[PDB]
Design an enzyme around this catalytic site. Structure first.
Site, PDB file in Angstrom:
ATOM      1  N   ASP A   1       0.806  -1.201   0.000  1.00 46.57           N
ATOM      2  CA  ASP A   1       0.000   0.000   0.000  1.00 46.57           C
ATOM      3  C   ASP A   1       0.846   1.262   0.000  1.00 46.57           C
ATOM      4  O   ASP A   1       0.600   2.178  -0.799  1.00 46.57           O
ATOM      5  CB  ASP A   1      -0.935   0.019   1.225  1.00 46.57           C
ATOM      6  CG  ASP A   1      -1.732  -1.257   1.390  1.00 46.57           C
ATOM      7  OD1 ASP A   1      -2.172  -1.868   0.396  1.00 46.57           O
ATOM      8  OD2 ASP A   1      -2.002  -1.597   2.543  1.00 46.57           O
TER       9      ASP A   1
ATOM     10  N   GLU B   1      -8.944  -2.605   3.641  1.00 43.67           N
ATOM     11  CA  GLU B   1      -8.620  -2.361   5.070  1.00 43.67           C
ATOM     12  C   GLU B   1      -9.818  -1.718   5.798  1.00 43.67           C
ATOM     13  O   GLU B   1     -10.083  -1.982   6.958  1.00 43.67           O
ATOM     14  CB  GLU B   1      -7.384  -1.502   5.216  1.00 43.67           C
ATOM     15  CG  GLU B   1      -6.134  -2.375   5.146  1.00 43.67           C
ATOM     16  CD  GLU B   1      -4.840  -1.583   5.171  1.00 43.67           C
ATOM     17  OE1 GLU B   1      -4.899  -0.333   5.118  1.00 43.67           O
ATOM     18  OE2 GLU B   1      -3.760  -2.218   5.222  1.00 43.67           O
TER      19      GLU B   1
HETATM   20  N1  LIG Z   1       7.853   0.058   9.645  1.00 40.57           N
HETATM   21  C1  LIG Z   1       7.139   1.074   9.091  1.00 40.57           C
HETATM   22  N2  LIG Z   1       7.844   2.074   8.561  1.00 40.57           N
HETATM   23  C2  LIG Z   1       7.192   3.054   7.944  1.00 40.57           C
HETATM   24  N3  LIG Z   1       5.889   3.217   7.795  1.00 40.57           N
HETATM   25  C3  LIG Z   1       5.200   2.196   8.314  1.00 40.57           C
HETATM   26  C4  LIG Z   1       5.726   1.136   9.015  1.00 40.57           C
HETATM   27  N4  LIG Z   1       4.690   0.259   9.381  1.00 40.57           N
HETATM   28  C5  LIG Z   1       3.586   0.866   9.030  1.00 40.57           C
HETATM   29  N5  LIG Z   1       3.838   2.053   8.361  1.00 40.57           N
HETATM   30  C6  LIG Z   1       2.797   2.919   7.798  1.00 40.57           C
HETATM   31  O1  LIG Z   1       1.543   2.456   8.294  1.00 40.57           O
HETATM   32  C7  LIG Z   1       0.652   2.125   7.199  1.00 40.57           C
HETATM   33  C8  LIG Z   1      -0.158   0.936   7.655  1.00 40.57           C
HETATM   34  O2  LIG Z   1       0.562  -0.326   7.588  1.00 40.57           O
HETATM   35  P1  LIG Z   1      -0.138  -1.643   7.614  1.00 40.57           P
HETATM   36  O3  LIG Z   1      -0.779  -1.890   8.947  1.00 40.57           O
HETATM   37  O4  LIG Z   1       1.120  -2.673   7.299  1.00 40.57           O
HETATM   38  O5  LIG Z   1      -1.228  -1.595   6.616  1.00 40.57           O
HETATM   39  C9  LIG Z   1       1.610   1.798   6.053  1.00 40.57           C
HETATM   40  O6  LIG Z   1       0.937   1.864   4.808  1.00 40.57           O
HETATM   41  C10 LIG Z   1       2.706   2.819   6.264  1.00 40.57           C
HETATM   42  O7  LIG Z   1       2.368   4.050   5.679  1.00 40.57           O
HETATM   43 MG   LIG Z   2      -1.654  -1.480   4.608  1.00 36.45          MG
END
Ligand SMILES: Nc1ncnc2c1ncn2[C@@H]1O[C@H](COP(=O)(O)O)[C@@H](O)[C@H]1O
Ligand SMILES: [Mg+2]
Ligand SMILES: Nc1ncnc2c1ncn2[C@@H]1O[C@H](COP(=O)(O)OP(=O)(O)OP(=O)(O)O)[C@@H](O)[C@H]1O
Ligand SMILES: Nc1ncnc2c1ncn2[C@@H]1O[C@H](COP(=O)(O)OP(=O)(O)OP(=O)(O)O)[C@@H](O)[C@H]1O
Ligand SMILES: Nc1ncnc2c1ncn2[C@@H]1O[C@H](COP(=O)(O)O)[C@@H](O)[C@H]1O
Ligand SMILES: [Mg+2]
Lengths: 271, 271
Positions: B50, B162
């Protein structure tokens, strides 16, 4: 009318019956918690008017629920950043609210760590204003952590007089689950506090966000440049100076993003 | 029809034209930024699908803005909690996105400082689950701090796959200014990345929020109990089994709160 539109959008009433407002707002709290099956509420208590009012309403709502044989509890939490200058008022608030539990979470060490890492990664020091917004978001996390560990809903203290100006931090004090003070003007809120038997010191207290390190306990009206009474007259539909209405009207549009879920291309409010 | 109402609330197209979707979403980004007069965007780059897609859209919008003679910029930021296990994918994403600036902010010391105070204040230790939510909200604070310092808007990566399951942290990754991926299913998103020429590793890996210390890189599908392919068929208007529809619809109604502004007694949705 723009003033008429705003009044309707913010759910403000020109006149209220304080006893009946209190009953309905406590009943809203009771009904919501029961529908969700939550175990009570959590709220950061500042010593200010709004949290004192919202905190007493929460306490009355959990007492009522238990009277009805249910199980609910209210956790009041102080969230100083090191030494709060008006802690005495907070302590007075607490005596008046009488919450089931009174916790404390000093946010200084988190904010410090965050600040130090920022300058280390970027080589820039956070400005006082930006640091103030970090403090407000940290209080959000702290409340959501207690709420998460204890099975509670996070109350928010937004009301019409803060809503119209967008005077709250986005995802900071603006981050909450439910809003028992929606539609009330600043003066109407004082009226409710007066009917509840609150100490005069809590409702004649100058409103402050007290986020800055360089300018502690700065007055809202200073940051705003309009008096809360002018604000209340506008919302209650009283006639005010065009210089007043236009500045209020302009700040409202500019802050619409705070009153909506994040923007997408299918949304028109921002266009 | 429940499926049909969700599809419309979420803004999902049973069928898309990928090149047209790219154009529309890069234009929304350009339209918003002009209206608000902001200087650009900031977004957390995780190395997952994403953020790779949104990051690329963002980069394209600012290059297009600067072409027409405007000024706008894009800061891509890594937000590891110490050592990120798939840092290599995140580096690959940056290489594909090609942002104007790539920064880094390690949230571990802020999270540890917080967890430590929690335990010092309450005598309790944060659950692994609740601590994972503090990581997510801390990343929000980091982005809003960079945006505040530099004058940029915070992009969020929420999309329909999501949104339908409320799989995002309230005021954590759900906290953003604008949403370029709204209405896209997980597969439609993969289609856009394929159109933009992304490396297959970025959309072949398993989606993961990776917030847990006890179970790092846990896949969404594990937490959810349903696969992204069943989720996409539902959203896309395809006839799925009674068992998918039941689970999805149960989950959607329980998370409505994540999709509205905080509830007040004047709102009907919660009743
Ligand atoms: N380790 C990470 N480093 C940078 N951004 C992150 C990280 N984990 C989550 N994010 C941000 O949080 C959003 C949600 O992540 P997710 O829960 O994997 O869908 C991602 O699309 C990123 O923009
Ligand atoms: Mg995501
Ligand atoms: N028009 C907009 N649409 C969406 N997001 C916006 C818009 N304008 C600003 N933002 C975002 O909101 C943040 C400002 O909100 P915040 O809650 O911090 O208010 P504040 O900065 O404390 O005070 P002020 O009322 O002066 O903005 C910005 O840093 C930016 O991320
Ligand atoms: N019906 C509701 N109305 C308002 N707020 C609610 C409701 N149910 C839960 N909450 C709040 O939402 C929080 C949960 O959202 P959050 O983003 O933290 O989700 P999560 O727990 O990570 O994931 P999931 O919610 O899918 O289990 C709870 O801590 C509580 O404060
Ligand atoms: N020092 C504090 N301690 C506890 N809660 C606080 C503190 N400062 C602010 N709050 C919370 O933040 C809300 C908004 O404050 P304000 O900006 O003064 O309107 C209050 O109503 C409290 O719930
Ligand atoms: Mg207040």
């Amino acid at each position: 009318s723009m003033q008429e539109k705003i009044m309707r959008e913010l759910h403000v009433k020109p006149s209220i019956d304080p006893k009946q407002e209190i009953e309905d707002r406590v009943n809203f709290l009771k009904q919501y918690v029961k529908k969700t099956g939550a175990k009570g509420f959590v709220l950061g208590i500042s010593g200010g008017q709004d949290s004192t009012l919202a905190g007493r309403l929460a306490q009355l709502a959990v007492e009522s629920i238990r009277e009805e044989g249910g199980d609910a509890q209210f956790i009041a939490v102080r969230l100083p950043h090191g030494t709060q200058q008006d802690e005495d008022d907070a302590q007075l608030a607490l005596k008046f609210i009488k919450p089931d539990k009174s916790w404390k979470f000093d946010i200084k060490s988190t904010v410090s760590a965050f600040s130090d890492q920022y300058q280390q990664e970027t080589g820039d020091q956070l400005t006082d204003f930006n640091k103030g917004n970090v403090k407000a978001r940290t209080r959000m996390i702290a409340q959501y952590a207690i709420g998460g560990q204890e099975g509670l809903l996070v109350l928010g203290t937004d009301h019409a007089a803060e809503a119209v100006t967008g005077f709250f931090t986005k995802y900071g004090d603006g981050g909450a689950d439910l809003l028992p003070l929606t539609g009330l003007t600043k003066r109407q809120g004082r009226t409710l506090l007066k009917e509840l038997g609150a100490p005069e010191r809590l409702y004649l207290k100058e409103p402050t966000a007290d986020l800055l390190d360089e300018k502690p306990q700065q007055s809202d009206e200073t940051e705003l440049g309009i008096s809360y009474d002018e604000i209340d007259d506008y919302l209650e539909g009283k006639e005010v100076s065009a210089k007043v209405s236009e500045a209020l009207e302009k700040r409202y549009s500019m802050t619409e993003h705070k009153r909506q879920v994040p923007a997408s291309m299918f949304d028109d409010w921002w266009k």
